[PDB]
Design an enzyme around this catalytic site. Structure first.
Site, short mmCIF file in Angstrom:
data_model
loop_
_atom_site.label_atom_id
_atom_site.label_comp_id
_atom_site.label_asym_id
_atom_site.label_seq_id
_atom_site.Cartn_x
_atom_site.Cartn_y
_atom_site.Cartn_z
CE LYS A 180 -3.76 -29.06 61.68
NZ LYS A 180 -2.79 -29.40 62.59
CB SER A 198 -7.26 -33.79 57.15
OG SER A 198 -6.37 -33.88 58.24
CD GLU A 205 -11.31 -33.81 59.95
OE1 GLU A 205 -10.71 -33.12 59.14
OE2 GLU A 205 -10.58 -34.91 60.34
CG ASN A 225 -0.81 -28.08 57.87
OD1 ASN A 225 -0.92 -28.41 56.98
ND2 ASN A 225 -0.45 -29.01 59.04
CG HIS A 270 -6.86 -35.98 62.61
ND1 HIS A 270 -6.57 -36.25 63.95
CD2 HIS A 270 -5.72 -35.77 61.75
CE1 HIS A 270 -5.10 -35.95 63.96
NE2 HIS A 270 -4.66 -35.55 62.79
CG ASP A 272 -10.41 -32.12 64.66
OD1 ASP A 272 -9.81 -30.53 64.19
OD2 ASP A 272 -9.73 -32.94 64.69
CG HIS A 309 -7.32 -28.68 58.66
ND1 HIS A 309 -5.72 -28.22 58.22
CD2 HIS A 309 -7.46 -29.79 59.03
CE1 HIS A 309 -5.35 -29.57 58.83
NE2 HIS A 309 -6.01 -30.23 59.20
C1 LIG Z 1 -8.16 -32.26 61.13
C2 LIG Z 1 -7.10 -32.43 62.17
N1 LIG Z 1 -7.48 -32.44 63.40
C3 LIG Z 1 -6.20 -32.59 64.38
C4 LIG Z 1 -5.04 -32.84 64.07
C5 LIG Z 1 -3.96 -32.78 65.10
O1 LIG Z 1 -3.63 -31.69 65.68
P1 LIG Z 1 -1.85 -31.23 66.30
O2 LIG Z 1 -1.41 -31.11 65.03
O3 LIG Z 1 -2.10 -30.03 67.08
O4 LIG Z 1 -1.80 -32.33 67.14
C6 LIG Z 1 -4.68 -32.62 62.61
C7 LIG Z 1 -3.29 -32.54 62.24
N2 LIG Z 1 -2.97 -32.52 61.06
C8 LIG Z 1 -1.57 -32.80 60.89
C9 LIG Z 1 -0.78 -32.39 61.87
C10 LIG Z 1 -1.38 -33.99 60.06
O5 LIG Z 1 -2.27 -35.04 60.58
C11 LIG Z 1 -0.24 -34.32 59.33
C12 LIG Z 1 -0.37 -35.85 58.57
C13 LIG Z 1 0.83 -36.00 57.64
C14 LIG Z 1 0.84 -37.35 57.08
C15 LIG Z 1 2.08 -37.83 56.45
C16 LIG Z 1 2.07 -39.13 55.57
O6 LIG Z 1 1.08 -39.64 55.26
O7 LIG Z 1 3.08 -39.38 55.20
C17 LIG Z 1 -5.65 -32.44 61.55
O8 LIG Z 1 -5.36 -32.63 60.50
MG LIG Z 2 -3.90 -33.32 59.31
#
Ligand SMILES: Cc1ncc(COP(=O)(O)O)c(CN[C@@H](C)C(=O)CCCCCC(=O)O)c1O
Ligand SMILES: [Mg+2]
EC number: 2.3.1.47
Length: 383
Positions: free
Chosen positions: A235, A178, A174, A46, A132, A203, A206
């Site tokens: 990210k 995501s 968002e 990311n 999310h 949010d 991204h």
């Molecule tokens: C829109 C959005 N908001 C908030 C967050 C959370 O923020 P933080 O990373 O600072 O705590 C994320 C994280 N996106 C990433 C980290 C994910 O959600 C990863 C998902 C991976 C799924 C894996 C699978 O399905 O096998 C995001 O995608």
């Molecule tokens: Mg995510």
């Protein structure tokens, strides 16, 4: 019993090939992925602007340790509120056009703390259906009522806001989604939100740093100021953490009632020095150069997919999905790419909805057109 409860659940996940295992990496962020001491082009991170390895960011992270030690020692409500934490918040608030910012250890924590502090059982949360998992989870656990509106459907949202409500309503969506990389109709969303005396919570994980002038994100770009904007730093910023942008009164409110902010250790001051430096790059001429190169690369990848028999899962952002038209949703084309030096990934439910397990490719400004040409080459063929 506990183990039976454990074991059964684990069994159900197996049955859908919904089982997740981590793979340990030497390098996971930015242009390159290194695994098994085997280098791959990285299309899974990311690190959208390639800042995870910016020399200035690295230096502020090191020097800050020199100056502040590591641990902050405690909660921001005691002796853990650093002047560097304060400066970062002021700079964030200045950058995005808000009166206040409040740092969180993570995006997940920020979203859950806000939704928890502010929503009560009389209230309603109208959230986009592909919001999310930290938002939906928290809105779910919230004693407030949760209604999802169909993806980007302002008509539907209007219908949910119009429904008689005993308390207040919070709209949540968002800036850059995501998993699909698309944007929300923000000005249209905010106007119906307003029509119903709602408050809007966006949010921008991204989009933050990656689009808009000075990389200010989805809201600036679209000329909207939600009453709550969450920005997250794992990210495009290339680090870790998050902040909640909001008014002075909401800010005060969040300081009293958001447990994750009161009862959790503040980030190490050196992490915060790193974030400030990241912000500096993002608002800098280098910031623009990086955003433009990322746009140049997206264009390149996207034009290239025209000659391909796949899904140009219409995205203008660094996120370029590919739904699964067949794949022990776990892997392939995913593996073929992997064996050929393009590290890609299979994203499956519950993270994704339905027969929608996919290849979530992500481009970054750390990449080069020859990297994209290769991913194009390999999606096309060559060996
Ligand atoms: C829109 C959005 N908001 C908030 C967050 C959370 O923020 P933080 O990373 O600072 O705590 C994320 C994280 N996106 C990433 C980290 C994910 O959600 C990863 C998902 C991976 C799924 C894996 C699978 O399905 O096998 C995001 O995608
Ligand atoms: Mg995510």
């Amino acid at each position: 019993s506990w183990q039976e409860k454990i074991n059964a659940a684990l069994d159900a996940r197996g049955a859908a090939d919904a089982l997740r295992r981590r793979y340990p990496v030497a390098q996971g962020a930015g242009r390159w992925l290194v695994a098994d001491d085997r280098q791959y082009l990285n299309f899974s991170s990311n690190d959208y602007l390639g800042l995870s390895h910016h020399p200035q960011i690295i230096r502020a992270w090191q020097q800050g340790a020199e100056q502040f030690g590591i641990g902050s020692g405690g909660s921001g409500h005691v002796s853990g509120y650093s002047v560097v934490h304060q400066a970062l918040e002021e700079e964030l608030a200045e950058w995005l056009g808000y009166s206040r910012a409040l740092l969180f250890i993570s995006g997940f924590a920020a979203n859950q703390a806000v939704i928890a502090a502010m929503m009560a059982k009389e209230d309603r949360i109208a959230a986009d259906r592909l919001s999310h998992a930290s938002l939906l989870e928290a809105a779910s656990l919230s004693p407030s009522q949760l209604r999802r509106f169909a993806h980007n459907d302002v008509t539907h949202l209007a219908r949910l806001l119009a429904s008689p409500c005993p308390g207040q309503q919070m709209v949540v969506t968002e800036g850059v989604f995501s998993m699909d990389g698309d944007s929300a109709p923000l000005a249209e969303i905010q106007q119906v939100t307003q029509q119903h005396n709602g408050w809007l919570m966006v949010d921008d994980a991204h989009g933050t740093g990656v689009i808009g002038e000075q990389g200010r994100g989805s809201c600036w770009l679209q000329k909207v100021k939600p009453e709550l904007l969450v920005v997250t730093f794992g990210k495009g910023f290339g680090v870790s953490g998050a902040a909640v942008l909001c008014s002075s009164t909401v800010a005060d409110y969040l300081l009293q009632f958001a447990r994750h902010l009161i009862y959790s250790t503040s980030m190490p001051p050196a992490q915060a020095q790193a974030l400030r430096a990241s912000l500096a790059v993002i608002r800098s001429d280098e910031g623009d150069a990086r955003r433009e190169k990322l746009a140049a690369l997206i264009t390149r990848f996207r034009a290239g997919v025209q000659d391909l028999p796949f899904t140009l899962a219409d995205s203008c952002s660094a996120i370029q999905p590919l739904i699964v038209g067949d794949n022990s949703r776990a892997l392939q084309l995913a593996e073929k790419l992997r064996q050929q030096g393009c590290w890609v990934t299979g994203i499956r439910p519950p993270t994704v909805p339905a027969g929608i397990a996919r290849l979530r490719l992500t481009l970054t400004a750390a990449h080069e057109m020859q990297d994209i040409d290769r991913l194009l080459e390999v999606l096309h063929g060559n060996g």
